[PDB]
From a paper:
The Yersinia outer protein J (YopJ) family effectors are widely deployed through the type III secretion system by both plant and animal pathogens. As non-canonical acetyltransferases, the enzymatic activities of YopJ family effectors are allosterically activated by the eukaryote-specific ligand inositol hexaphosphate (InsP6). Among them, PopP2 produced by the root-infecting bacterium R. solanacearum acetylates a conserved lysine residue in WRKY transcription factors to inhibit the expression of defense-related genes. Both the binding pockets of InsP6 and the acetyl group donor acetyl-coenzyme A (AcCoA) are located on the interface between the regulatory domain and the catalytic core.
To understand how InsP6-binding induces the structural change of YopJ effectors, we crystallized the entire acetyltransferase domain (residues 149–488) of PopP2 in the absence of InsP6. The catalytic triad, including His260, Asp279, and Cys321 residues, are well preserved in the structure. Structural comparison of the apo-PopP2 structure with that of the InsP6-bound PopP2 reveals that the catalytic core is well conserved, giving a root mean square deviation (RMSD) of 0.5 Å over the Cα atom of 248 aligned residues. The most striking difference lies in a segment ahead of the N-terminus of the regulatory domain (residues 351–375), which is able to adopt two entirely different structures with distinct sets of packing interactions. In the apo conformation, this segment exists as a long α-helix (αF) that is packed against αE and β5 mainly through hydrogen bonds and hydrophobic interactions; by contrast, in the PopP2-InsP6 complex structure, the same set of residues are folded into two antiparallel β-strands (β6’ and β7’) linked by a long loop (Lβ6’β7’).
Numbering used by the authors: 146 to 282, 296 to 302, 305 to 371, 449 to 484
Amino acid sequence: GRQAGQQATVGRLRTQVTGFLSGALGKLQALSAQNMDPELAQFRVLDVDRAIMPLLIVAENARNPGLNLVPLHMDMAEDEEVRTQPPMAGSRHIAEFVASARPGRYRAVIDDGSHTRAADIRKDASGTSVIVVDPLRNVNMEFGAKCAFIPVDIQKSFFDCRILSLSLALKMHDKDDAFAAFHETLRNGGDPSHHVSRAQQTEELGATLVLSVEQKRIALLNRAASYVNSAPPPVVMRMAKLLQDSL
């Protein structure tokens, strides 16, 4: 009876998650009405995006084994007075992640309290390197374990950066080897032409990354919902917990 007694709870949570994603789709459809003020739509979509991003991340991690997307945030995202929005549910401070994460290859969306950016992270015994994609459409400034920023010809957008960062993370997964190469370059700090090579590669990476937000969001939601239908009980419990936490 407990195979059933537990199947009821799972079905319940599953229906919660499904109903939520469907509700989000509804809101998005209403916000894209001919009547709607687009600025108002952006403002409204802030909360929608914050709420659905964890679920999108879970789903997309399932659909693309190896993506290993993790939501991360920085110090300013923990300042209640300054941050525009609280970090999404399940978000971890980047420090804690660097210290605790199982070694390997990750994609990330990093929230700094204002904007979210895509990133590729590699944790070795050698150390950890973080490659941050930075939509700019600070010369010779480095930050920190090793971090490198790749300037890309993409409009920096407060309202679009979550979905855009998700998309870019997917593309980084698609260009896994290029980013691995840059990780090795970033690790090989010793080489005399490092500074050049790095910079060179930076440019190149940028290009490969740039080679609508609304449509992408819709598609991601559909994929997420259809995944939630067939999703296993652990995943269901997880997503449900994230959803509950977001409120």
